Amino acid sequence: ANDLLSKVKKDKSDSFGVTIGIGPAGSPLLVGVGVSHSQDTSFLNELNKY
Amino acid sequence: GVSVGKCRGILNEIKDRNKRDTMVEDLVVLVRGGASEHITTLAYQELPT
């Protein structure tokens, strides 16, 4: 009798966001900048032999 | 303003198990001497008693 098993799982996550605000005054001025990013990675593998 | 966040994750796991076992047994008899039904009943290959 022989048994073989292998079950592996992989998970990855990443997220980043940038915010910038610039304004000259003296004639008031305003500039807004918004950045958002998100990354997710998931992997699943299972092997079984008998 | 400047801000940026970096995150990285990784997981790995493997489990393995195997088992093997065998057992063999034999029995041989040897009878010489006897023609009547007594030795015929004793010639039963099926309990060495």
From Swiss-Prot, chain A:
Transmembrane segments: 16-24, 27-34
Localization per Swiss-Prot or TrEMBL: Secreted; Target cell membrane
Disease linkage: Complement component 8 deficiency, 1: A rare defect of the complement classical pathway associated with susceptibility to severe recurrent infections, predominantly by Neisseria gonorrhoeae or Neisseria meningitidis.
Task performed by this protein: Component of the membrane attack complex (MAC), a multiprotein complex activated by the complement cascade, which inserts into a target cell membrane and forms a pore, leading to target cell membrane rupture and cell lysis. The MAC is initiated by proteolytic cleavage of C5 into complement C5b in response to the classical, alternative, lectin and GZMK complement pathways. The complement pathways consist in a cascade of proteins that leads to phagocytosis and breakdown of pathogens and signaling that strengthens the adaptive immune system.
Quaternary structure and interacting proteins, as annotated: Heterotrimer of 3 chains: alpha (C8A), beta (C8B) and gamma (C8G); the alpha and gamma chains are disulfide bonded. Component of the membrane attack complex (MAC), composed of complement C5b, C6, C7, C8A, C8B, C8G and multiple copies of the pore-forming subunit C9.
Family of the protein in this entry: Belongs to the complement C6/C7/C8/C9 family.
Protein name listed in UniProt: Complement component C8 alpha chain
Organism: Homo sapiens (Human)
Gene name for this UniProt entry: C8A
Residue numbers of the full-length protein present here: 233 to 282 of 584
From Swiss-Prot, chain B:
Superkingdom classification of source: Eukaryota
PTM comment: N-glycosylated; contains one or two bound glycans. Not O-glycosylated.
Compartments, record wording: Secreted; Target cell membrane
Chain positions with Phosphothreonine modification: 22
Self-association and partners: Heterotrimer of 3 chains: alpha (C8A), beta (C8B) and gamma (C8G); the alpha and gamma chains are disulfide bonded. Component of the membrane attack complex (MAC), composed of complement C5b, C6, C7, C8A, C8B, C8G and multiple copies of the pore-forming subunit C9.
Protein family according to the UniProt entry: Belongs to the complement C6/C7/C8/C9 family.
Clinical note on disease: Complement component 8 deficiency, 2: A rare defect of the complement classical pathway associated with susceptibility to severe recurrent infections, predominantly by Neisseria gonorrhoeae or Neisseria meningitidis.
Function: Component of the membrane attack complex (MAC), a multiprotein complex activated by the complement cascade, which inserts into a target cell membrane and forms a pore, leading to target cell membrane rupture and cell lysis. The MAC is initiated by proteolytic cleavage of C5 into complement C5b in response to the classical, alternative, lectin and GZMK complement pathways. The complement pathways consist in a cascade of proteins that leads to phagocytosis and breakdown of pathogens and signaling that strengthens the adaptive immune system.
UniProt-recorded name of the protein: Complement component C8 beta chain
Source species: Homo sapiens (Human)
